[PDB]
A paper describes a structure:
Two homologous tankyrases, TNKS1/ARTD5/PARP5a and TNKS2/ARTD6/PARP5b, catalyze a post-translational modification, poly-ADP-ribosylation, of target proteins. Tankyrases are enzymes (EC 2.4.2.30), which belong to a family of proteins known as human Diphtheria toxin-like ADP-ribosyltransferases. Tankyrases control β-catenin phosphorylation through regulation of the stability of destruction complex by ADP-ribosylating Axin and therefore inhibition of tankyrases offers an attractive strategy for treating cancers with increased Wnt-signaling. Tankyrase inhibitors interact with the NAD+ binding groove of the catalytic domain and they bind either to the nicotinamide subsite, the adenosine subsite or span across both sites.
Numbering used by the authors:
A (entry chain A): 952 to 1112
B (entry chain H): 1115 to 1161
Write the structure that this text describes.
């Protein structure tokens, strides 16, 4: 039930998503080991992901959270990188998309920095890099990230190195 | 998947060392995220 609709680069919606991608790149403490060495991206395509059943699954849970938190979903737009992007857009997020070994326990992780999520496109630690060239800093192979609507509700604050 | 801390719906990882890093977040229910945009891109080699 998932359809992908291309956004035109002339569309304000394309432009605001591209700006969030580009403007949230940062340098990483690994010097580029996991995600590659770069300051910006070449955006090739931005598609809207349309799935009625998955959207209703999201809004159902969003209302449950909001009602538990004085009518405040605390909804954010955040990046997600994963080897399982295809599974996610067709079947939805679930426990098989969790980072079992993450710093905050086994859950599904999202980043404000697009470059943080870029470190996970080829797996934890960048895995072995792109499938064609085995290069975590490949400048040739096309990568994909998701820009996701996320309900945080009441969020537990961890101060962390 | 783990559970959210009791009385909470997510965890926020606030950076406490790298002053330039932004926050990271964890949810423990897949129903709390919807993949609105699929972005296809390359990283660019710095000049
Ligand atoms: O976008 C992110 N993806 C991931 C990530 C990590 C692991 C996996 C994964 C999922 C299933 C099996 C193996 N690995 C999927 C996504 N971790 C992050 C951690 C911090 C901030 C952002 C992310
Ligand atoms: Zn490659």
């Amino acid at each position: 039930g998932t359809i992908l609709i291309d956004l035109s680069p002339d569309d304000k919606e394309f432009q605001s998503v591209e700006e969030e991608m580009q403007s949230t790149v940062r340098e990483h403490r690994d010097g580029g080991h996991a995600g590659g060495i770069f300051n910006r991206y070449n955006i090739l395509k931005i598609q809207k992901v349309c799935n009625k059943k998955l959207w209703e699954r999201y809004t159902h849970r969003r209302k449950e959270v909001s009602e538990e938190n004085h009518n405040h979903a605390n909804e954010r737009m955040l990046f997600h990188g994963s080897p399982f992007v295809n599974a996610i857009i067709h079947k939805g997020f679930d426990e098989r998309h969790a980072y079992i070994g993450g710093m905050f326990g086994a859950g599904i992780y999202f980043a404000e920095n697009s470059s943080k999520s870029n470190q996970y496109v080829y797996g934890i630690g960048g895995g072995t890099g792109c499938p064609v060239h085995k290069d975590r800093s490949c400048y040739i192979c096309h990568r994909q990230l998701l820009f996701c609507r996320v309900t945080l509700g009441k969020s537990f604050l961890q101060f962390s190195a | 998947m783990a559970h959210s801390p009791p009385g909470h719906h997510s965890v926020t990882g606030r950076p406490s060392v790298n002053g330039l890093a932004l926050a990271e977040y964890v949810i423990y229910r897949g129903e709390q995220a919807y993949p609105e945009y699929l972005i296809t891109y390359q990283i660019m080699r710095p000049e």
